[PDB]
Amino acid sequence: IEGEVVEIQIDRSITGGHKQGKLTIKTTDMETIYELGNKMIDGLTKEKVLAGDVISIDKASGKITKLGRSFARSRDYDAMGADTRFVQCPEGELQKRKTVVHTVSLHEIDVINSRTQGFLALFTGDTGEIRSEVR
Amino acid sequence: ETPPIVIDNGSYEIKFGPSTNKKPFRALNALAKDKFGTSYLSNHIKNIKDISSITFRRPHELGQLTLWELESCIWDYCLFNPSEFDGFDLKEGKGHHLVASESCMTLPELSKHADQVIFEEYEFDSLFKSPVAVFVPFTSDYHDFQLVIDSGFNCTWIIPVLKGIPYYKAVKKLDIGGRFLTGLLKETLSFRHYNMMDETILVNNIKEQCLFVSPVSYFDSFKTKDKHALEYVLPDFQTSFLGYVRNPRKENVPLPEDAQIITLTDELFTIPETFFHPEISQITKPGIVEAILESLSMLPEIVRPLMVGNIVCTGGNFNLPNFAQRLAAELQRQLPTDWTCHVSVPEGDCALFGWEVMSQFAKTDSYRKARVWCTKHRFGYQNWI
Amino acid sequence: KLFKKNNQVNRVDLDFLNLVFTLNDKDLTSYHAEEISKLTCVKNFVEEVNKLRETNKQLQEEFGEASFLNFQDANQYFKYSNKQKLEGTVDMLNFLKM
Amino acid sequence: RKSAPSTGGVKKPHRYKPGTVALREIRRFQKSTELLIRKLPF
Amino acid sequence: KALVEEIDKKTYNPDIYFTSLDPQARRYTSKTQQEILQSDRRFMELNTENFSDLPNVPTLLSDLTGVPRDRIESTTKKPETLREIQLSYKSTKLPKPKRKNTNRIVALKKVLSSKRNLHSFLDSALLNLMDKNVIYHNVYNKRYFKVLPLITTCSICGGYDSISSCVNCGNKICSVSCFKLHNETRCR
Amino acid sequence: KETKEVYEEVTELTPEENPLGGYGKTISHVIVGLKSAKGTKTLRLDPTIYESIQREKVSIGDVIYIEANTGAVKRVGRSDAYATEFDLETEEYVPLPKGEVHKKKEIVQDVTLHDLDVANARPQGGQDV
């Protein structure tokens, strides 16, 4: 789920419930509002997310993709000083499930499986005689 | 005459007939106050050709049965007419026995007045009345401990029974019943279509013939609605008064009867879901499962698993398909693994099942014990607490 | 994700079978080892596994392996609570013997 | 007995008609040419 | 996160950060009788099988429940039964007592009339049922609504997939068109 | 070959105190409950398993499977029972398991001694040096 936001609501723990949260998200076509998920307050507070940016959330992963700031009207967004690479025009509809095609080779898979952090070994070349049963 | 007349006082239909035939007869208990200038008896409503103009006053209301004049007229039209109902003849009934069925929530004043009405107008020498759950033990040979659900036309009831005797201390009621499916069904049809007025049998027969009860939850029903749809044709009131069932794979009749094909994909499942999650229908009803668990909680732990071990169903709410497996799955949940529950609900038909049960009860010694203060120790339920 | 999904199916705990023994060195002696491995094998559990088999027999006499629950045990709930304990504890003591 | 009183006497079906045609015309045909003040005063 | 953050020695609220981002005016998360009133009204309508009877339905529910009809209709959009039972068959029924006034009615009212009506039956004081209602209904809690309560499927197009809720009304919407018209026409 | 008995939402959890010694504080017992599908059942255990499940960071209302052999328990995920608790979330929906409160399954494994001795020689563990 992507779309331009306006502000971010992150509340504290109170008597009634866990927290308070109501994100209004805008796009080119239609703008709506959603609510937090307890963990999402921590996820949004991990980084200093500025109010009014195009950030995409995959609920299957929960990874914030701060691609750029909210385009909306560029009269207030005409002198960023570079940054965000000419932001991005919002696409409108929000509920989208797009497949991701990833191309990998057998070496990457076995190197990843071999060690605790196989990607670092892949990027450094210290694999050291990978065992055959893994292969 | 030892074999009595098996009278089953029901809000929708009152069963009757002798205690010998294997097939009970049908007679709707309602008045068709037709606006076009005619009025019909209890068996002259199914032969009328105009339905878009009617407003009935049923004797049975949310509380109790009210219009005694209509009930008496239906009684004297039913028993004193042997041509309409073959094999049903009785002039006075001085020596004839009688069996009557009524709700457990009957007030003492109603019990006294009704029993006196029987004793004075019909002069039955002996009679016996009890709620439908009390007939379950009669099915020693007669049973002792069962749990009975009475999904009545007015209100659904929960009856714990021990020693063949109801336990009225933990009796629970839930108004969700007949009377209601047609309610949200008609409301949804009016919301998704045009406005229809002055009709009370279209939605009822629609529920009776082309609905079922929520395969396991709301989810299966609300996506499988499209593939398992059925386009019931609304009978246009300009020429027609009764409709028929159509399905996109087993079309009974494909001709447009006065056009106007209604696509019943959505709202096929609302009422079949109000029995457990009324919050979907924006109503604060508990549900049958919450009521039964509350009644069991009030029941002592010594007797709790025994009642859930033998579950039976009474009433016509179970006539529609897809009812036994859902309730079985539900009672499978809630109850922990320590206590195991067995499903022994009647196979659909229950009004006839209760008729057969009371027919059997008329042939045993149970009827000869509490047969005629009359509404106190024989028809009275205080001695059975 | 595509790999660490069958660990809930085909995982086998070699540690459960005591096949990681090399890491379990610096905490044990043998004077308890042989004594317990014999005593708990025969004399400590002869009075337990046989008692729990007797509770199996007690369940059988209780109600037909729960067959006569609604007809015989209908009016008695204490025997119900005995029957819930018997088979559970005998299975747990079988686990204890393994 | 049976039913000595009643036996009908008065029944009448009615309600709606005048507004149904107007609403169907409004939905199937837009409205224009609004009211103008009387010509002779002007 | 980026290293070195500038704090103005004010606000200093690490967990709280927002202004409102409401577009909802009211307090959805924090600070009823309207719910139960509409519930009983739509329940009596659920009892009715006629749409022409709908004007007569409020009169029936006012006569049965006893609550005034005017206030209920403005807000929301059995002794009586014994009374018409007594007046129904004045020519047939004969109400003669048989000592019934001093033998059974006391314990009868203790057992059956412990809760006078269905509303009391669902809220019996002999045990707990409203808390039982909340425990069983694992859908929403009371008072503090941390979820911005909502409703059912697409109300116009009849769609099923991609359901969501409009900001103001809360009327559930799905797909497009109906998701747009149920927002524009129901924009409150 | 080897057989395993495993116990599989969670109804509740509650610890049970005075240590009668120099220890600071502890719980005499811990009582928990598991929902599952084939009926629910409560469970009494030792605060060690309570500590382990606390380290697993599992919500009170959640689906949990607990190993009877050693007590190792991992977060199965957010159960399907508490669906759409809020408008947006990230936890897996994890449909509730269909089975008894406790389940016994037979496992057959085929390994070589070469895996055995390298497993023996290679050390394991967590934060130890």
Ligand SMILES: Nc1ncnc2c1ncn2[C@@H]1O[C@H](COP(=O)(O)OP(=O)(O)O)[C@@H](O)[C@H]1O
């Ligand atoms: N086709 C149907 N679908 C669902 N429910 C039905 C159908 N036909 C009848 N019923 C229900 O069966 C109930 C039977 O109630 P009944 O036993 O007559 O109550 P009582 O015993 O109090 O007179 C009716 O109240 C109605 O709710």
Ligand code: BEF
């Ligand atoms: F009142 Be019913 F339909 F038997």
Ligand SMILES: [Mg+2]
């Ligand atoms: Mg009946």
Ligand SMILES: [Zn+2]
């Ligand atoms: Zn729609």
Ligand SMILES: [Zn+2]
């Ligand atoms: Zn809105």
